[PDB]
């Protein structure tokens, strides 16, 4: 029966409520109880505040009007306002104090996940204060999670006027009895109730969610910890830079602040960063999530040497040049991991900080041919299988769904071992035709990958593995250097190819190397443990790149 849920901002989706600072300020300053709310409400429907909430005047216009009101209120209550009593101050402080009420957001999210139309309906104002950005950010962080945001100051109507509830129903395309409406203010619920909306009077959050749980029959309280926000590809800003005549790089871009360039591994996509993209943007960074050369909407020239580390690095440098970025933070995973270490060694002036997930930095051995090094580690056998052009392309392209469904598996689900792949004749020789779906990925998500790999297949991606010698030679040029810029290595307990122990000497080359470690995490780090990854990157960004 219920199909829609409507939430207020102040006192429902964000806390403490601002009316609340009228009360607290009275107490703090020992003023007549209610003096500030009387001034706030003076004149009711024709008073300054209603005009503010209606969008007739801006916040800064309102501030001196509320001052006058307070003076008037205190004259009539035969009291004096403190020396330096300041509505600007009171409001600046209250507005920055209010934070998202996470459990209420999370309930709204969950309701939207079981198919509810969700909306924010709020009495709010046109905010032109020097400090307005703070509210702009909050509304940004909130509005993305909802089907509609209805703002009194944009629609010219206010709670509790009945016309806004009609406007509400009309925006929802629902009848009143299909709607639950939550609010901290009783008078504001009334007209919703009159229309036969289910209403919840929100005092403490948890009780309000209990009422909301009963009335919708969906679990909202004590629910397990949700995944971070993911990205919907067609809501992203998509960026394209031509770095040389046959080569254009695609990336997705979210946020403002220091530039952070995310470099995916084989055989993946910008979309492999879908859990980190909103989190890092939210954390105050400018995220650029690449399709690395070979993939997705980036170019995929066929020649092998187009994919040696050297060309790949120079290209990433050009990419910064064309965007006008003097540096970026480089974060990589798997192949992207190897690439960012090389960015650090060959272009430190361009790398603000460098971090790798899974991929250790290991210097080239100038005494041992790379092929030999590779044959001395049974778990790298899969790399010899990738050498012969065509062979792995045929297996990987034969059935894209099956490929990603077989590759993308959590540590407790695996169907392919990277062990004696050559001998077996292939990567999937002993895995099913139709693998089950990993817990890490939905069917929709696999199909995104499938669709990206239909543009270029696996030739470009596999070429990354086909420059062992050429990379080795270039890497030997760097054997005297150390990495002395800020650097983080994140190991993954259950990656059986890029094992933690392979990273164990890195401090010799990178003396101030910082570390993180994720337990019970397979090779597909970002999607296996997205919460831990986000937490580890943001803490490291904030302290080393900021």
Ligand X SMILES: N#Cc1cccnc1N1CCNCC1
The residues that touch ligand X, with contacts defined as CB under 6 A, are 265-266, 334, 407, 416, 418, 497, 523
Closer residue to its own copies, CB minimum distance, 128 or 206: 128
The distance of closest approach from Cβ of residue 50 to its own copies in the complex, given in angstroms and rounded to an integer, is 12
Closer residue to Mg ion, CB minimum distance, 184 or 297: 184
The distance of closest approach from Cβ of residue 375 to its own copies in the complex, given in angstroms and rounded to an integer, is 30
Confirm or deny that 222 is annotated as ligand binding: no
CA neighbor of 546 nearest in space, from 286, 192, 361, 238 = 286
Closer residue to its own copies, CB minimum distance, 35 or 329: 329
- C-alpha distance from residue 436 to each of 402, 413, 421 (Å): 9, 9, 21
Our finding on whether 7 is near Mg ion (CB under 5 A) is no
CA distance 135 to 137: 5
How large is the C-alpha radius of gyration of the chain? 28
307, 470 contact by CB (below 8 A): no
Among 127, 151, 178, 184, binds Mg ion (CB under 5 A): 184
Confirm or deny that 8 is annotated as ligand binding: yes
Confirm or deny that 382 is annotated as ligand binding: yes
Pairing of strands 514-518, 487-492: parallel
- What residue 325 binds from its own copies, ligand X, Mg ion, none (CB within 5 to 8 A, per partner kind)? its own copies
The distance of closest approach from Cβ of residue 410 to ligand X in the complex, given in angstroms and rounded to an integer, is 11
CA neighbor of 432 nearest in space, from 402, 396, 393, 408 = 402
Confirm or deny that 10 is annotated as ligand binding: yes
Strand-pair partners of 489:
356, 515
- What residue 184 binds from Mg ion, ligand X, its own copies, none (CB within 5 to 8 A, per partner kind)? Mg ion
Residues interacting with its own copies, by CB under 8 A? 51, 55-58, 60-61, 126-128, 132-133, 135-137, 139-140, 143-144, 154, 156, 234-242, 253-256, 259, 278, 281, 286-287, 321-327, 346, 348-350, 352, 477, 480-485
> For 91, how many CA atoms within 13 A lie in the half-sphere containing its CB?
20
Burial 71-95 (b: 16+ CB within 10 A, else e): eebbeeeeeebeeebebbebbeebb
The distance of closest approach from Cβ of residue 399 to its own copies in the complex, given in angstroms and rounded to an integer, is 31
Strand-pair partners of 260:
287, 329
The DSSP output letter for 536 is H
Our finding on whether 11 is near Mg ion (CB under 5 A) is yes
Report the SS3 class of residue 122.
strand
Residue with structure tokens 């040389």?
244
The catalytic site residues sit at 334, 465, 523
- What residue 133 binds from ligand X, its own copies, Mg ion, none (CB within 5 to 8 A, per partner kind)? its own copies
Confirm or deny that 232 is annotated as ligand binding: no
The distance of closest approach from Cβ of residue 119 to Mg ion in the complex, given in angstroms and rounded to an integer, is 15
Confirm or deny that 147 is annotated as ligand binding: no
Closer residue to its own copies, CB minimum distance, 57 or 462: 57
List, in order, residues 6 or more apart from 513 with CB less than 8 Å away. 483, 487, 488, 489, 506, 507
- Binding-site residues for substrate sit at 382
Annotated binding site: 8, 10, 122-123, 184, 382
């Amino acid at each position: 029966t219920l199909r829609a849920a409507v939430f207020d901002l102040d006192g429902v989706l964000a806390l403490p409520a601002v009316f609340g600072v009228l009360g607290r300020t009275e107490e703090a300053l020992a003023l007549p109880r209610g003096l500030l709310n009387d001034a706030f409400q003076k004149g009711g429907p024709e008073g300054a505040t209603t005009r503010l909430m209606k969008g007739e005047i801006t916040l800064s216009q309102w501030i001196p009007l509320m001052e006058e009101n307070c003076r008037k209120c205190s004259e009539t209550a035969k009291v004096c306002l403190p020396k330096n009593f300041s509505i600007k101050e009171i409001f600046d402080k209250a507005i920055s104090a209010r934070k998202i009420n996470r459990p209420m957001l999370q309930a709204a999210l969950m309701l939207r996940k079981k198919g509810f139309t969700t909306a924010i309906l709020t009495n709010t104002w046109l905010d032109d204060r020097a400090e307005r950005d703070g509210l702009a950010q909050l509304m940004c962080e909130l509005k993305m999670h909802f089907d509609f945001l209805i703002e009194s100051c944009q629609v010219g109507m206010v709670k509790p006027e009945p016309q806004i509830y009609k406007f509400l129903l009309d925006t929802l395309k629902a009848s009143p009895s299909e709607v639950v409406f939550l609010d901290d203010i009783g008078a504001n619920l009334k007209p919703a109730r009159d229309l036969g909306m289910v209403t919840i009077l929100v005092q403490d959050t948890d009780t309000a969610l209990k009422e909301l749980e009963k009335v919708t029959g969906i679990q909202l309280l004590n629910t397990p910890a949700p995944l971070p926000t993911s990205c919907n590809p067609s809501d992203m800003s998509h960026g394209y830079v031509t770095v040389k005549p046959r080569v254009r790089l695609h990336f997705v871009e979210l946020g403002s602040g220091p530039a952070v360039c995310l470099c995916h591994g084989f055989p993946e996509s910008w979309y492999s960063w879908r859990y980190q993209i909103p989190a890092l943007a939210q954390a105050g960074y400018r995220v650029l999530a690449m399709d690395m050369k070979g993939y997705g909407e980036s170019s995929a020239p066929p020649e092998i040497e187009e994919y040696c580390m050297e060309v790949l690095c120079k290209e990433m440098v050009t990419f910064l040049d064309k965007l006008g970025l003097s540096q970026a933070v480089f974060i990589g995973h798997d192949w992207g991991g190897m690439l960012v270490w090389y960015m650090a060694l060959f272009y430190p002036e361009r790398v603000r900080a460098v971090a790798s997930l899974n991929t250790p930095f290991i210097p080239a051995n100038p005494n041992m041919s790379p092929l030999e090094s590779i044959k001395a580690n049974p778990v790298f056998d899969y790399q010899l299988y990738f050498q012969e052009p065509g062979v792995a392309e045929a297996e990987l392209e034969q059935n894209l769904s099956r490929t990603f469904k077989s590759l993308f598996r959590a540590s407790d689900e695996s169907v392919l071992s990277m062990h004696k792949v050559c001998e077996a004749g292939g990567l999937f020789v002993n895995s099913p035709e139709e693998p089950s779906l990993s817990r890490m990925v939905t069917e929709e998500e696999i199909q995104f990958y499938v669709q990206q790999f239909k543009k270029s297949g696996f030739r470009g991606p596999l070429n990354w593995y086909r420059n062992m010698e050429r990379n080795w030679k270039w890497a030997c040029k760097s054997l005297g250097r150390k990495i002395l810029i800020p650097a983080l290595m994140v190991t993954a307990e259950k990656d059986f190819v890029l094992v933690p122990q392979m990273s164990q000497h890195m401090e010799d080359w990178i003396p101030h190397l910082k570390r993180g470690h994720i337990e019970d995490c397979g090779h597909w780090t970002q999607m296996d443990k997205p919460t831990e990854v986000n937490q580890i990157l943001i803490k490291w960004l904030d302290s080393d790149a900021r």
